Amino acid sequence: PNYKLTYFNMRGRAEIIRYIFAYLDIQYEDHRIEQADWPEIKSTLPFGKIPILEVDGLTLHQSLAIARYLTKNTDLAGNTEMEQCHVDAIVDTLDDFMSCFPWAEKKQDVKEQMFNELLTYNAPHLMQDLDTYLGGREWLIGNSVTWADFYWEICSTTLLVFKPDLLDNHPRLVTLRKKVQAIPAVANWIKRRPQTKL
Amino acid sequence: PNYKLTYFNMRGRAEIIRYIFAYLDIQYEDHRIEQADWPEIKSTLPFGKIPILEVDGLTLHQSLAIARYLTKNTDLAGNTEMEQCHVDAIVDTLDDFMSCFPWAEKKQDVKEQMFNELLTYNAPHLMQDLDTYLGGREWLIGNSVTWADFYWEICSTTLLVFKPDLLDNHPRLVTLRKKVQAIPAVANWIKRRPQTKL
Ligand SMILES: N[C@@H](CCC(=O)N[C@@H](CS)C(=O)NCC(=O)O)C(=O)O
Numbered sequence: 144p145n146y147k148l149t150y151f152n153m154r155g156r157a158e159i160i161r162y163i164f165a166y167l168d169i170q171y172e173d174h175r176i177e178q179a180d181w182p183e184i185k186s187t188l189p190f191g192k193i194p195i196l197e198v199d200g201l202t203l204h205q206s207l208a209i210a211r212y213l214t215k216n217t218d219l220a221g222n223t224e225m226e227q228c229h230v231d232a233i234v235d236t237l238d239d240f241m242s243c244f245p246w247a248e249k250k251q252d253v254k255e256q257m258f259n260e261l262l263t264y265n266a267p268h269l270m271q272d273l274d275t276y277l278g279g280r281e282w283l284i285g286n287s288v289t290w291a292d293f294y295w296e297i298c299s300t301t302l303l304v305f306k307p308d309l310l311d312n313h314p315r316l317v318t319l320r321k322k323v324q325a326i327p328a329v330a331n332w333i334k335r336r337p338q339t340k341l
Numbered sequence: 342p343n344y345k346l347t348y349f350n351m352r353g354r355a356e357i358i359r360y361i362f363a364y365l366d367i368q369y370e371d372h373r374i375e376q377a378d379w380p381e382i383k384s385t386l387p388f389g390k391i392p393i394l395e396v397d398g399l400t401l402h403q404s405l406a407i408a409r410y411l412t413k414n415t416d417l418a419g420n421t422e423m424e425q426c427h428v429d430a431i432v433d434t435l436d437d438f439m440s441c442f443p444w445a446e447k448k449q450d451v452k453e454q455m456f457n458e459l460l461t462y463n464a465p466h467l468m469q470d471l472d473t474y475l476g477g478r479e480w481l482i483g484n485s486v487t488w489a490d491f492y493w494e495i496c497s498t499t500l501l502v503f504k505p506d507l508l509d510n511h512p513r514l515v516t517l518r519k520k521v522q523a524i525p526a527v528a529n530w531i532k533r534r535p536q537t538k539l
């Protein structure tokens with residue numbers, strides 16, 4: 144089909160979709176809107192939220208729903224129904240934590256305090272749980288890369304902006320990031336994508 | 342398969358799994374724990390959260406990952422890949438909203454204020470978006486019931502505890518709740534499940 148992804152000019156919640164299209168070598172329109180565009184665009188959306196992916200004229204929404212759709216019947220999905228469950232579960236665990244952050248908080252002092260508390264008091268527990276889950280394995284699930292590995296690299300990239308030492312006790316989680324970033328199609332996307340804070 | 346579900350004695354995030362088991366007529370251990378014996382159990386769980394489902398000795402986590410695993414290759418999944426994406430997306434839209442509520446927030450003042458703000462301002466927008474999405478159709482996705490309709494019924498049941506007038510302007514959403522509740526296997530489970538507030 145023809146694909147049109149609509150999101151802000153940010154990695155954010157679209158980036159997982161962008162990595163999947165890159166890895167699979169699938170062409171798509173990467174439509175990046177400005178804030179000034181938002182009201183007009185929002186009025187068309189099913190639940191007033193982006194990203195959305197238009198597929199031959201039909202709208203999909205929810206970043207992870209779309210990610211899962213794009214990876215079905217590909218080597219990124221997980222090799223068994225059980226492993227597909229593990230992929231989903233790891234992704235939702237990461238997403239649950241990312242959703243704790245007050246990204247829309249206007250009071251900058253309150254926002255900063257909350258970010259620093261989450262990254263200092265809460266994040267280390269998740270990092271240890273992830274490290275223990277990965278153990279000595281090459282990838283989070285199965286014997287080959289899945290979109291859970293991609294989501295780890297995406298989420299950790301943003302977390303590292305606010306907490307540079309996040310992974311100083313977890314070299315195995317850094318190695319995993321590096322392994323994702325070394326995949327040629329992914330490396331190419333990372334190199335060429337617009338440089339945005341988030 | 343041999344299934345053991347572990348959660349609190351609460352509908353909460355386990356209820357969607359319980360509906361799927363009931364609808365599919367699958368036998369399982371409904372293991373309900375208390376906060377007293379939690380830290381014993383918590384330390385053994387992969388990411389320190391419940392629900393978990395043990396399948397033939399193997400542990401799965403994340404309620405929606407589990408729900409999806411159980412509905413794969415059943416009539417509850419959605420009839421095309423695109424429709425399966427729609428199911429997933431509705432479920433995450435509902436979950437995103439339910440997860441905004443600070444359920445475990447001990448600072449009484451912010452909890453009361455947040456609940457009130459989500460229910461007064463956000464909830465009516467979501468109800469309008471859902472009603473518009475449903476339109477005149479019988480089920481949320483496709484021509485038959487999916488686990489997205491189950492999740493609607495479950496989420497709305499909890500929202501109605503806090504906002505009884507939630508669906509005053511949305512008869513079609515109430516009709517959908519009743520259609521789910523009238524499915525014999527679901528009806529039976531609703532009748533026999535422990536009566537909890539949440
Ligand atoms: N869980 C959803 C969350 C979508 C979401 O909340 N998107 C934000 C932007 S990142 C949005 O559209 N907010 C509404 C607004 O900006 O008015 C997903 O991953 O797609």
Ligand SMILES: N[C@@H](CCC(=O)N[C@@H](CS)C(=O)NCC(=O)O)C(=O)O
Nearest residue numbers: 239353354389390391392403404405
């Ligand atoms: N998105 C996860 C949420 C898991 C979660 O946060 N569960 C809560 C209970 S509803 C929990 O285990 N909290 C940790 C604790 O009580 O220490 C899921 O749906 O499984």
Ligand SMILES: [Mg+2]
Nearest residue numbers: 235238433436
């Ligand atoms: Mg989620």
